[PDB]
Amino acid sequence: QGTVNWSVEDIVKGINSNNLESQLQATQAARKLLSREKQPPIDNIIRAGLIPKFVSFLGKTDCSPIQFESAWALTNIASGTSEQTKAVVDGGAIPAFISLLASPHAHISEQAVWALGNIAGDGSAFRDLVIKHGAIDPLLALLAVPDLSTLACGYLRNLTWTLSNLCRNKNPAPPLDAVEQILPTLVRLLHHNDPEVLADSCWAISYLTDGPNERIEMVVKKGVVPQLVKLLGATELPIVTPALRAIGNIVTGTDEQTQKVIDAGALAVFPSLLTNPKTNIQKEATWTMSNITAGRQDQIQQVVNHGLVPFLVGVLSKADFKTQKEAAWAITNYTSGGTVEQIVYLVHCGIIEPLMNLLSAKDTKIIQVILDAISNIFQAAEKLGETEKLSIMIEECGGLDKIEALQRHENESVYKASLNLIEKYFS
């Protein structure tokens, strides 16, 4: 009640006094204003020019409470818009917070961790700026214990989250040496028993694997794939989501990198993923599948062996359109690099009808994708001399009607392929 609902001008008055305790009192009052969920007066506090004062309070070693209160107040200012975070940075908060990482008071170093997390989370520039100030060493030292379980849950969760922000964002991606420096601790967090630490550890790994093959390799070589695959089967959605994202990122790389995902036993989880109630999970799982069917023939064969083709037929038959679109890609990739037998197996699974039905979609791009898949399947049928057997299949399900109509489509690329099919296999 003492420091509850102060006016900004009273806070300004207490902070401008030459009384450290008065300043502490005013700072707490500011912290409480900024701690409210309904429109905290962040811009009002900034306009009052209180930031430089807060920053100086960070270095008041003899008055830890005011160190804590200002750190908390600055954290919440830094949690706002880019402009508001910039204000905190502009005040010299970065080095001051990094100095607090070594505080003997756990709740104060934690607040510093939290603050740096918000600053780094703004984007690439501030992220790299926090790194240049040398935040990584002191951050990792806080996690350098024989067993993470001895750390307070909240403390560990904050450390993990802040680290994940240091791994986040592109253009540019985090510095290579920074990633290398962080990875070993990150891998360790990836094995912790706490659901929130696991979720944010997966997000970190997902950020790191979201780039060129070299970035993917840095992570893969650390041997995290088996663990990712395991977390991929976790019950918690917040864990599955980032885990799937990471696996999805990894299979966009080389065939060898993709193979590690397969060897880890990832495909066995996909019967669930491809039928998951959360559409975002279905979409990303199908997307992941499309990048696997874009692999080698022995990898396509692994997809067949795990009985995932029927699941692709299902998603193609019924699913959120965005998911169905990833399924169309999955089939086209499959038919592009697959053997004749593998492609034939596709048809026997019933891929044709659900494929034809999606030719009624208004998305020009999916029509192009489907038409290419058809071409590929006919080419496989040509080597068997059974193109006609396919023509009847497509005709009986009302596919020919749609291909014919696609000749009067408005898009150049579409009708070209349409008539090519029409006059080559249907005349």
Binding site: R36, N76, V251, G253, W287, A294, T332, N333
Partner: peptide
């Protein structure tokens, strides 16, 4: 074929 590729801030409340 080829392969196709694809909260940051937290306020501390009571």
């Amino acid at each position: 074929n080829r392969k196709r590729r694809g909260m940051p801030k937290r306020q501390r409340i009571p």
